[PDB]
């Protein structure tokens, strides 16, 4: 019904505990029973991870079923034993709790920070995964230098999707920071792509974070309180080793972010406790008004011209899957000859075809143009 | 009391509960969930057919099923009833409106987020309730980590049928006015332990949600949720994620408050002109008015609400001052409206 795997030193001192059980209550019960039986004070152990793990592909949970965990424990100098064998017949999900000792926690925080560096991969750009005109790829190839960038985006190209398409690599980030009993969460299940777990650190793809002025609030750049002694780190702490993209941000925000990057760390006080956290990320600001930031200095500036008639026809044919006539280009407003305009036209034309059955596609395109123009 | 998945018929709640407990004890309670409760086999042809589709055989009613059957309904039987619900259709023949306004309003059939600059004071919810036909299936309630969330409410939903854990209803049309309602309608309000009331956008699944002069922050939150495709929340230490699917309409007379936000469709309804105003007056009053009365009424009254007010005043005057000609009554009503000029 349950199983416990314990990793301890050569002298028998238990330092790592992992518990598999059917549900949460049984897992908590067996964890506390194991803590009590071995004469271990609960305050010396900090809970690192907990949740439902998939055991669909595992017949049973034995020491011979966990090899990656054995290697991880061996690298730190701990050996692992089990109190029994758990049979996962007819079971898909299983609740699991992972806890480590506090002294091991601070040793990892202060001295063992360079142990799992043989897992990260250098970031690379693979531009073959996107279908874009050649000149735009040439202009956008400057993003591989990994410097702060300002993009005069007159083509309305969506930077976050492009970056998510052509970025490969892996980075290692702390799951959460326990500073003076105060817990700050950095790993985000919504914005980060899980790729592994190494005790108190998580291996993910290089983060890409997006912030739109017209859709998001400025409270995201502050330590938001979720629960008592449980806070959420600001956006620039969740872009550690990745990209932070700002769409039409205020000038003061960009100035503050540049000064924070220059200083190298963020200092604050929460509930009468001092917090200081280092900063490491890359900044992209994509705007259509470039003179708003005339005082600030950006090493890289990229300008994107609007789509021309030939390129607009090519992109429209690629997106719609049909060949539009040339005179179509004369019935659309000049400000709609962008990538976003093409996407809007595609969606509206698809819905029109789904409604007005039986009409030809050219008439549907003309009706969509009339609807857009009004 | 009669017991037939468990279905109990009884005269009162207490008898039904006692008989259900006795039946559960006799056959040798925690394995079942009461999914419905409140006010012959051949008579229940629909129930017999529904039980046959589940592989089984067949006042105050109680209806309960097992948790495993609940999971089977969630996963095995999530598309069996796509043949029982009709498609949403628009029929603009149930209302009498000018042609240039029906042509503009026909764009609502595309089912996209819309902003309506309503200078004609048209009643959007009444028009939509009049012209919309179809049926949809929505879950009666949602179970998430031993938490119950109410999705179906009797006041705002038009019942058409109940199929176990789901309800077939008319396409929902929810209306929210800034001056008349509170913002707690958009939060997971709690009534009793382990039972919560879903926000408005969860009770408008598959239908329309109309907002009247809403704040900008609420619109931003709704647009962000729609782009995300789901809502994530924390309740009593439990994380809950629920998908959302609805259409959003923002009715306003001050569109400059929503300049930054993006909507696929913008519909402008201009105020009535002389010809349309005369036509609407003739349609509603039941008499033919002359042209001079165009210059009597104040400009702001040349809308639909103004026409309704004029009709009410005309009916009152006709009730009071009997025997007079209708043109004189119309002129008197116009004089009363302007307060003697």
XYZ file of C-alpha atoms in Angstrom:
715
model
C 0.000 0.000 0.000
C 3.007 2.270 0.547
C 6.780 2.280 0.141
C 9.602 4.406 1.560
C 13.057 4.909 0.038
C 15.685 6.368 2.371
C 19.072 7.747 1.369
C 21.606 7.979 4.187
C 25.337 8.366 4.745
C 27.817 5.618 5.617
C 27.279 6.218 9.349
C 23.521 5.623 9.027
C 22.360 9.243 9.299
C 19.188 9.604 7.219
C 19.210 12.656 4.945
C 16.850 11.947 2.004
C 13.337 10.487 2.235
C 10.920 9.655 -0.575
C 7.486 8.166 0.100
C 5.046 6.587 -2.362
C 1.454 5.997 -1.255
C -2.080 5.725 -2.598
C -3.312 9.157 -1.476
C -2.290 12.197 0.559
C -3.510 11.124 4.009
C -1.769 7.738 3.905
C 1.410 9.388 2.608
C 1.429 11.910 5.460
C 0.716 9.159 7.996
C 3.537 6.906 6.803
C 5.951 9.844 6.520
C 5.303 10.954 10.098
C 5.456 7.353 11.346
C 8.838 6.867 9.655
C 10.064 10.159 11.126
C 8.951 9.103 14.615
C 10.300 5.541 14.476
C 13.857 6.529 13.500
C 14.062 9.147 16.305
C 14.177 12.097 13.903
C 12.796 15.511 14.821
C 10.400 16.750 12.096
C 11.769 20.305 12.284
C 15.120 19.054 10.942
C 13.462 17.966 7.664
C 12.119 20.354 5.018
C 9.569 19.137 2.476
C 10.936 19.664 -1.036
C 8.346 18.129 -3.365
C 4.927 16.495 -3.238
C 2.345 15.457 -5.788
C 0.932 12.788 -8.055
C 3.472 10.809 -10.090
C 2.623 8.564 -13.031
C 3.424 4.884 -12.445
C 1.604 3.532 -15.497
C 4.764 2.037 -17.031
C 6.117 0.561 -13.765
C 5.089 -2.883 -12.534
C 6.614 -2.435 -9.069
C 8.650 0.096 -7.100
C 11.978 -1.415 -6.020
C 15.571 -0.279 -5.642
C 16.125 -1.872 -9.065
C 13.309 0.264 -10.514
C 14.899 3.644 -9.649
C 18.268 4.103 -11.367
C 18.360 7.872 -11.919
C 17.600 8.429 -8.229
C 20.350 5.965 -7.305
C 22.835 7.845 -9.490
C 21.799 11.204 -8.015
C 22.237 9.896 -4.468
C 25.571 8.316 -5.389
C 26.885 11.606 -6.757
C 26.208 13.286 -3.399
C 27.782 10.397 -1.472
C 24.597 8.846 -0.052
C 23.421 5.247 -0.387
C 19.758 4.311 -0.733
C 17.718 1.517 0.852
C 14.047 0.539 0.786
C 11.722 -0.821 3.464
C 9.797 -3.055 1.061
C 8.357 -3.594 -2.403
C 5.203 -1.853 -3.635
C 3.115 -3.408 -6.415
C 1.545 -0.907 -8.834
C -0.787 -3.354 -10.598
C -3.776 -1.523 -12.051
C -2.582 1.882 -10.801
C -1.867 4.984 -12.903
C -1.148 7.788 -10.408
C 0.546 7.534 -7.018
C 1.109 10.237 -4.415
C 4.773 10.928 -3.674
C 6.555 13.094 -1.099
C 10.249 14.041 -1.293
C 12.048 15.605 1.682
C 15.697 16.376 2.445
C 17.514 17.366 5.615
C 18.142 21.028 6.396
C 21.923 20.683 6.687
C 22.018 19.029 3.260
C 19.742 21.822 2.024
C 22.130 24.569 3.133
C 25.154 22.583 1.916
C 23.550 22.427 -1.534
C 22.768 26.141 -1.246
C 26.333 27.127 -0.316
C 28.899 24.512 -1.345
C 27.296 21.922 -3.663
C 26.098 24.530 -6.185
C 28.376 23.116 -8.918
C 27.460 19.430 -8.689
C 24.836 18.962 -11.435
C 26.430 21.214 -14.071
C 27.020 18.244 -16.403
C 23.326 18.230 -17.364
C 22.775 21.727 -18.797
C 23.016 22.349 -22.540
C 24.162 25.569 -24.182
C 21.324 27.444 -25.863
C 21.238 27.373 -29.664
C 19.089 28.900 -32.401
C 17.517 26.690 -35.086
C 15.883 28.993 -37.637
C 14.851 26.129 -39.944
C 11.709 25.478 -37.858
C 9.895 28.639 -39.023
C 8.508 29.616 -42.432
C 9.431 33.287 -42.828
C 10.705 35.446 -45.694
C 14.477 35.359 -46.035
C 15.091 39.040 -45.273
C 13.202 38.832 -41.981
C 15.250 35.788 -40.956
C 18.427 37.696 -41.823
C 17.336 40.665 -39.712
C 16.216 38.497 -36.783
C 19.402 36.400 -36.745
C 20.989 39.073 -34.516
C 19.031 37.699 -31.533
C 21.619 34.924 -31.081
C 24.095 37.327 -29.443
C 22.027 37.263 -26.208
C 22.091 41.002 -25.508
C 19.390 43.495 -24.572
C 17.371 44.278 -27.686
C 14.867 46.880 -28.873
C 12.613 45.893 -31.780
C 10.821 48.457 -33.950
C 8.031 46.009 -34.779
C 6.159 47.568 -37.685
C 5.468 44.097 -39.132
C 3.419 43.090 -36.048
C 5.385 39.837 -35.833
C 4.762 37.836 -32.650
C 8.158 37.530 -30.972
C 7.231 35.063 -28.161
C 5.963 32.336 -30.511
C 8.974 32.752 -32.802
C 11.345 32.443 -29.842
C 9.480 29.406 -28.500
C 9.833 27.842 -31.955
C 13.575 28.268 -32.524
C 15.183 27.886 -29.080
C 16.700 24.663 -27.741
C 18.676 24.087 -24.570
C 18.310 23.451 -20.860
C 18.881 25.508 -17.707
C 18.793 24.701 -13.995
C 16.803 26.894 -11.604
C 15.925 26.724 -7.886
C 12.396 25.525 -7.204
C 11.892 27.839 -4.219
C 13.945 29.936 -1.808
C 13.477 29.485 1.950
C 15.004 32.678 3.355
C 14.576 33.011 7.134
C 11.552 30.654 7.179
C 9.938 32.747 4.403
C 9.180 30.793 1.222
C 9.380 32.456 -2.200
C 8.357 30.423 -5.245
C 10.298 30.787 -8.504
C 9.399 27.689 -10.528
C 6.080 28.264 -12.314
C 4.097 25.317 -13.672
C 2.220 27.668 -16.029
C 5.170 29.465 -17.660
C 7.962 26.857 -17.405
C 8.403 23.580 -19.285
C 9.338 20.703 -16.987
C 12.320 18.607 -18.074
C 13.547 16.968 -14.859
C 14.093 17.359 -11.137
C 17.354 17.407 -9.158
C 16.465 17.657 -5.456
C 16.022 21.388 -4.801
C 16.640 22.394 -8.430
C 14.593 21.907 -11.594
C 15.869 21.474 -15.153
C 13.729 23.353 -17.692
C 13.949 24.845 -21.151
C 15.275 28.429 -21.335
C 12.364 30.507 -20.022
C 10.487 32.869 -22.326
C 8.288 35.351 -20.446
C 5.954 37.858 -22.110
C 4.355 40.970 -20.613
C 1.704 42.958 -22.486
C 0.864 46.437 -21.216
C -2.782 46.362 -22.317
C -3.526 42.967 -20.728
C -1.368 42.682 -17.586
C -0.988 44.617 -14.344
C 2.112 46.146 -12.776
C 1.679 44.001 -9.646
C 3.529 41.164 -11.415
C 6.827 42.965 -10.711
C 6.260 42.775 -6.938
C 6.430 40.015 -4.341
C 2.784 38.939 -4.333
C 1.514 37.204 -1.203
C -0.252 33.936 -2.011
C -0.351 32.509 1.514
C 1.105 33.345 4.905
C 4.896 33.021 4.641
C 4.352 31.966 0.992
C 5.094 34.522 -1.745
C 5.464 34.518 -5.530
C 8.649 35.937 -7.024
C 8.357 38.818 -9.528
C 8.598 38.270 -13.281
C 12.293 39.104 -13.674
C 13.188 36.390 -11.153
C 11.239 33.798 -13.166
C 13.143 34.674 -16.367
C 16.472 33.511 -14.896
C 18.662 32.449 -17.807
C 16.006 33.153 -20.437
C 14.178 36.024 -22.105
C 11.812 38.704 -20.811
C 9.782 40.391 -23.559
C 7.920 43.655 -22.970
C 5.200 44.907 -25.328
C 4.786 48.697 -25.150
C 5.985 49.137 -21.544
C 6.270 52.457 -19.696
C 9.652 54.171 -19.806
C 10.047 54.097 -16.016
C 9.671 50.308 -15.961
C 12.409 49.871 -18.573
C 14.677 52.288 -16.700
C 14.108 50.399 -13.443
C 14.800 47.048 -15.111
C 18.029 48.343 -16.665
C 19.180 49.722 -13.306
C 18.302 46.423 -11.602
C 20.335 44.517 -14.194
C 23.257 46.906 -13.681
C 23.190 46.601 -9.878
C 23.054 42.805 -10.108
C 20.580 41.968 -7.340
C 17.237 42.906 -5.799
C 16.960 43.924 -2.136
C 13.714 44.093 -0.170
C 12.173 43.480 3.251
C 9.156 41.204 3.752
C 7.448 40.773 7.135
C 10.504 42.224 8.854
C 12.991 39.950 7.077
C 15.705 41.084 4.666
C 15.768 39.435 1.224
C 18.521 39.789 -1.388
C 18.366 37.805 -4.630
C 20.681 37.907 -7.682
C 19.412 38.828 -11.146
C 20.376 37.203 -14.463
C 18.187 37.520 -17.564
C 17.979 39.004 -21.059
C 15.630 41.841 -22.020
C 13.707 42.380 -25.262
C 11.438 45.398 -25.739
C 9.212 45.221 -28.823
C 7.402 48.464 -29.610
C 5.876 50.456 -32.446
C 6.829 53.833 -30.910
C 10.645 53.894 -30.639
C 11.217 57.534 -29.630
C 9.585 56.908 -26.237
C 12.865 55.330 -25.043
C 15.284 57.841 -26.554
C 17.289 58.311 -23.351
C 18.022 54.672 -22.572
C 20.816 52.677 -24.207
C 20.268 49.328 -25.918
C 23.194 47.475 -27.546
C 21.015 45.922 -30.284
C 18.258 47.585 -32.322
C 16.259 45.626 -34.914
C 13.817 47.289 -37.322
C 11.105 45.326 -39.141
C 9.577 46.973 -42.239
C 5.922 46.374 -43.146
C 4.985 43.606 -45.547
C 4.993 44.561 -49.222
C 2.381 43.486 -51.769
C 4.261 40.438 -53.077
C 5.216 39.216 -49.603
C 1.679 39.883 -48.363
C 0.274 37.737 -51.176
C 2.782 34.960 -50.464
C 2.008 34.929 -46.731
C -1.748 35.075 -47.361
C -1.516 32.120 -49.750
C 0.587 30.184 -47.236
C -1.823 30.808 -44.351
C -5.168 30.430 -46.138
C -4.190 27.443 -48.282
C -5.742 29.018 -51.393
C -4.408 31.250 -54.147
C -5.977 34.726 -53.886
C -6.281 36.973 -56.946
C -3.913 39.916 -57.227
C -6.564 42.654 -57.062
C -7.344 41.455 -53.519
C -4.366 43.557 -52.398
C -6.322 46.664 -53.437
C -9.300 46.008 -51.124
C -7.459 45.798 -47.798
C -6.491 48.808 -45.666
C -2.757 49.595 -45.497
C -2.557 48.963 -41.740
C -3.855 45.390 -42.157
C -0.893 44.176 -44.255
C 0.874 42.556 -41.303
C 1.193 39.080 -39.815
C -1.475 39.816 -37.197
C -3.749 41.133 -39.932
C -3.226 37.904 -41.867
C -4.146 35.850 -38.794
C -7.286 37.927 -38.190
C -8.324 37.577 -41.836
C -7.707 33.827 -41.665
C -9.873 33.378 -38.566
C -12.713 35.538 -39.885
C -12.629 33.825 -43.296
C -12.699 30.397 -41.641
C -15.763 31.338 -39.597
C -17.448 32.871 -42.660
C -16.853 29.685 -44.657
C -18.209 27.672 -41.729
C -21.384 29.799 -41.755
C -22.096 30.750 -45.397
C -21.896 27.301 -46.952
C -21.915 27.004 -50.736
C -20.256 30.295 -51.677
C -16.922 30.505 -53.457
C -13.760 31.414 -51.572
C -13.140 34.664 -53.478
C -16.529 36.049 -52.433
C -15.776 34.988 -48.856
C -12.474 36.884 -48.991
C -14.228 39.980 -50.340
C -16.888 39.750 -47.621
C -14.179 39.401 -44.967
C -12.449 42.487 -46.369
C -15.723 44.429 -46.252
C -16.330 43.293 -42.662
C -12.821 44.348 -41.618
C -13.071 47.737 -43.329
C -16.644 48.314 -42.140
C -41.958 4.842 -1.921
C -40.524 3.025 -4.954
C -36.860 2.167 -5.556
C -35.307 1.348 -8.928
C -27.691 3.756 -10.285
C -30.381 4.296 -7.637
C -33.663 6.156 -8.188
C -36.137 6.769 -5.353
C -39.708 8.064 -5.649
C -41.410 9.202 -2.449
C -44.031 11.621 -1.172
C -41.610 13.533 1.078
C -37.874 13.972 1.568
C -37.735 12.146 4.912
C -39.426 9.009 3.572
C -37.147 8.992 0.522
C -34.021 9.318 2.675
C -35.138 6.597 5.095
C -36.021 4.181 2.287
C -32.732 4.910 0.506
C -30.800 4.177 3.705
C -32.778 0.969 4.256
C -32.139 -0.181 0.679
C -28.419 0.601 0.940
C -28.184 -1.326 4.218
C -30.185 -4.273 2.859
C -27.936 -4.804 -0.179
C -24.714 -4.181 1.808
C -23.304 4.555 1.116
C -19.835 6.068 0.697
C -19.547 4.515 -2.786
C -22.409 6.630 -4.189
C -22.938 10.341 -4.839
C -26.372 11.963 -4.655
C -26.501 13.746 -8.016
C -30.108 14.981 -7.920
C -32.899 15.438 -5.392
C -36.120 17.364 -4.938
C -39.550 17.881 -6.451
C -44.392 3.010 -13.882
C -41.576 1.525 -15.957
C -43.537 2.007 -19.188
C -44.245 5.642 -18.296
C -40.488 6.262 -17.936
C -39.617 5.410 -21.531
C -36.915 8.093 -21.620
C -35.387 6.814 -18.374
C -35.529 3.221 -19.631
C -33.795 4.186 -22.882
C -31.134 6.165 -21.008
C -30.453 3.221 -18.689
C -30.296 0.906 -21.700
C -27.660 3.126 -23.296
C -25.615 2.578 -20.111
C -26.020 -1.211 -20.265
C -28.552 -1.386 -17.415
C -32.255 -2.161 -17.096
C -35.130 -0.169 -15.630
C -43.597 13.933 -6.189
C -40.142 13.759 -4.593
C -37.262 12.176 -6.522
C -33.742 11.173 -5.493
C -31.138 10.148 -8.088
C -27.701 8.816 -7.132
C -24.862 7.033 -8.941
C -21.492 5.550 -8.017
C -18.132 7.299 -8.286
C -16.895 4.747 -10.825
C -20.025 5.401 -12.886
C -19.272 9.117 -12.499
C -15.792 8.568 -13.952
C -17.276 6.469 -16.760
C -19.639 9.329 -17.606
C -16.736 11.794 -17.552
C -14.441 9.723 -19.784
C -16.297 6.880 -21.524
C -19.559 8.748 -22.226
C -18.290 12.271 -22.946
C -19.590 12.316 -26.549
C -22.480 9.823 -26.640
C -25.086 12.606 -26.361
C -23.894 14.828 -29.215
C -26.924 13.579 -31.191
C -29.510 14.875 -28.693
C -28.637 18.605 -28.760
C -29.685 20.866 -31.628
C -27.342 23.377 -33.231
C -27.571 27.070 -32.377
C -29.554 28.943 -35.031
C -30.567 32.574 -35.544
C -34.094 33.515 -36.653
C -34.563 37.266 -37.126
C -38.238 36.831 -38.077
C -39.472 36.782 -34.458
C -38.863 40.537 -34.016
C -39.836 43.657 -35.963
C -36.834 45.918 -36.568
C -35.726 48.173 -39.431
C -33.694 46.465 -42.132
C -30.516 48.524 -41.716
C -30.382 47.434 -38.070
C -31.015 43.722 -38.660
C -28.282 43.740 -41.307
C -25.850 45.254 -38.793
C -26.924 42.910 -35.978
C -26.605 39.795 -38.149
C -22.845 39.830 -37.399
C -23.533 38.296 -33.967
C -24.005 34.926 -35.700
C -20.223 34.577 -36.118
C -19.886 33.856 -32.361
C -16.960 36.164 -31.603
C -16.173 38.692 -28.892
C -18.039 41.867 -29.795
C -18.226 45.497 -28.692
C -21.483 47.349 -29.376
C -21.510 51.151 -29.455
C -25.217 51.376 -28.621
C -26.491 54.868 -29.379
C -29.953 53.468 -30.206
C -30.592 52.201 -26.641
C -31.562 48.792 -28.016
C -32.269 46.004 -25.518
C -29.670 43.398 -26.486
C -30.625 40.636 -23.979
C -34.304 40.725 -24.971
C -33.444 40.605 -28.678
C -31.081 37.670 -28.140
C -33.643 35.796 -26.038
C -36.212 36.392 -28.782
C -34.136 35.393 -31.819
C -31.853 32.601 -30.529
C -32.891 28.945 -30.795
C -30.956 25.784 -30.045
C -29.895 23.491 -27.225
C -26.680 22.748 -25.325
C -25.518 20.284 -22.674
C -23.817 21.599 -19.539
C -22.718 19.677 -16.419
C -25.006 20.147 -13.435
C -22.000 20.502 -11.122
C -18.233 20.036 -11.205
C -16.265 17.794 -8.840
C -12.649 18.834 -8.225
C -10.622 17.237 -5.413
C -13.576 16.666 -3.065
C -14.924 20.142 -3.915
C -18.342 20.747 -5.484
C -18.931 23.721 -7.793
C -22.449 24.650 -8.912
C -22.708 25.217 -12.665
C -26.456 24.934 -13.318
C -28.738 27.437 -11.581
C -32.513 27.397 -11.940
C -33.034 31.168 -12.152
C -30.746 31.986 -15.092
C -31.111 28.699 -17.026
C -34.104 27.411 -18.999
C -34.490 23.699 -18.286
C -35.177 21.357 -21.202
C -33.973 17.990 -19.927
C -31.822 16.197 -17.377
C -29.491 13.390 -18.491
C -27.867 12.006 -15.322
C -25.017 14.380 -14.433
C -25.674 16.777 -17.334
C -28.525 19.151 -18.149
C -29.760 19.985 -21.646
C -30.848 23.638 -21.672
C -31.314 26.570 -24.003
C -28.138 28.445 -24.999
C -27.345 30.513 -21.900
C -27.741 34.288 -22.082
C -26.307 36.015 -18.999
C -26.557 39.771 -18.420
C -24.503 41.837 -15.973
C -25.105 45.534 -15.295
C -22.540 47.656 -13.472
C -25.014 49.722 -11.439
C -27.292 46.802 -10.504
C -24.952 43.907 -9.639
C -21.848 43.249 -7.553
C -18.411 41.998 -8.573
C -18.635 38.936 -6.304
C -20.521 37.307 -9.187
C -17.061 36.847 -10.762
C -15.528 35.050 -7.761
C -15.825 31.513 -6.391
C -18.386 32.542 -3.795
C -18.884 30.116 -0.910
C -22.296 29.253 0.536
C -21.615 26.093 2.550
C -18.628 23.859 3.229
C -17.365 22.033 0.116
C -20.029 23.624 -2.125
C -19.200 26.802 -4.055
C -20.990 28.886 -6.688
C -19.133 29.234 -9.976
C -18.473 32.709 -11.432
C -20.569 34.117 -14.271
C -18.316 32.953 -17.111
C -18.662 29.331 -15.956
C -22.474 29.476 -15.979
C -22.385 30.977 -19.501
C -20.787 27.886 -21.065
C -21.671 27.661 -24.748
C -23.758 30.833 -24.665
C -23.483 34.610 -24.349
C -22.247 36.875 -21.555
C -23.334 40.505 -21.960
C -21.766 43.282 -19.892
C -23.251 46.770 -19.531
C -20.656 49.497 -18.911
C -18.137 47.217 -17.152
C -14.876 48.421 -15.593
C -11.714 48.076 -17.654
C -10.034 45.692 -15.197
C -12.870 43.162 -15.459
C -12.663 43.209 -19.261
C -8.888 42.750 -19.084
C -9.305 39.762 -16.765
C -11.953 38.186 -18.999
C -9.873 38.664 -22.158
C -6.788 37.224 -20.448
C -8.785 34.199 -19.273
C -10.198 33.666 -22.771
C -6.710 33.828 -24.289
C -5.431 31.393 -21.652
C -8.297 28.981 -22.317
C -8.745 27.967 -18.671
C -9.053 29.334 -15.139
C -6.662 28.328 -12.353
C -7.467 28.971 -8.704
C -6.622 27.958 -5.142
C -9.402 26.874 -2.768
C -8.796 25.603 0.784
C -5.231 24.680 -0.146
C -6.272 22.767 -3.286
C -5.320 23.774 -6.824
C -8.208 23.709 -9.312
C -8.063 24.134 -13.096
C -11.210 24.422 -15.221
C -11.581 25.072 -18.974
C -13.777 27.953 -20.121
C -15.703 28.518 -23.351
C -18.117 31.414 -23.862
C -18.879 34.421 -26.049
C -18.378 37.955 -24.723
C -20.441 41.023 -25.642
C -19.655 44.481 -24.250
C -22.519 46.965 -24.661
C -21.537 50.579 -24.082
C -22.129 54.195 -25.027
C -18.572 55.235 -24.034
C -16.150 53.181 -26.156
C -13.087 55.342 -25.422
C -12.731 53.557 -22.070
C -11.740 50.383 -23.977
C -9.293 51.793 -26.532
C -6.316 49.574 -25.722
C -8.209 46.283 -25.637
C -8.832 44.331 -28.838
C -12.145 42.914 -30.039
C -12.661 41.163 -33.394
C -16.014 42.872 -34.059
C -17.172 46.445 -33.411
C -20.824 47.249 -34.166
C -22.074 50.850 -34.150
C -25.807 51.505 -33.798
C -26.657 55.087 -34.839
C -29.657 57.009 -33.489
C -32.869 56.872 -35.492
C -33.325 59.419 -38.270
C -36.608 61.050 -39.301
C -37.863 58.277 -41.594
C -36.940 55.456 -39.214
C -38.352 57.356 -36.229
C -41.663 57.852 -38.046
C -41.733 54.194 -39.101
C -41.098 52.963 -35.550
C -43.724 55.347 -34.159
C -46.276 54.079 -36.683
C -45.357 50.467 -35.890
C -45.660 50.840 -32.112
C -48.494 53.346 -31.621
C -50.799 51.748 -34.190
C -51.634 55.056 -35.907
C -50.090 57.025 -38.750
C -48.428 60.219 -37.469
C -47.686 63.269 -39.639
C -44.263 64.750 -40.398
C -44.490 67.889 -38.242
C -44.245 65.851 -35.026
C -40.665 65.097 -36.091
C -39.660 68.622 -35.037
C -41.543 68.551 -31.710
C -39.799 65.794 -29.759
C -36.351 66.512 -28.293
C -33.382 64.973 -30.141
C -32.417 62.616 -27.305
C -35.834 60.914 -27.407
C -35.277 59.584 -30.953
C -34.277 56.118 -29.743
C -36.116 52.894 -28.938
C -36.438 53.656 -25.217
C -37.820 57.081 -26.080
C -40.349 55.430 -28.389
C -41.446 53.107 -25.580
C -41.843 56.050 -23.192
C -43.864 57.947 -25.807
C -46.083 54.897 -26.308
C -46.702 54.558 -22.565
C -47.559 58.256 -22.218
C -49.843 58.069 -25.266
C -51.678 55.065 -23.820
C -52.114 56.846 -20.481
C -53.465 59.998 -22.149
C -55.814 57.969 -24.355
C -57.081 56.213 -21.228
C -57.697 59.535 -19.474
C -58.877 62.011 -22.142
C -61.524 60.004 -23.977
C -63.057 61.027 -27.295
C -60.195 63.151 -28.624
C -58.413 62.564 -31.919
C -55.124 60.681 -31.908
C -53.058 63.488 -33.463
C -54.148 65.836 -30.675
C -53.170 63.225 -28.082
C -49.761 62.795 -29.724
C -49.184 66.559 -29.723
C -50.274 66.775 -26.077
C -47.908 63.947 -25.118
C -45.058 65.676 -26.948
C -45.862 68.915 -25.112
C -45.854 67.063 -21.781
C -42.491 65.466 -22.615
C -40.808 68.833 -23.224
C -42.449 70.436 -20.175
C -44.367 73.204 -21.928
C -41.346 74.429 -23.934
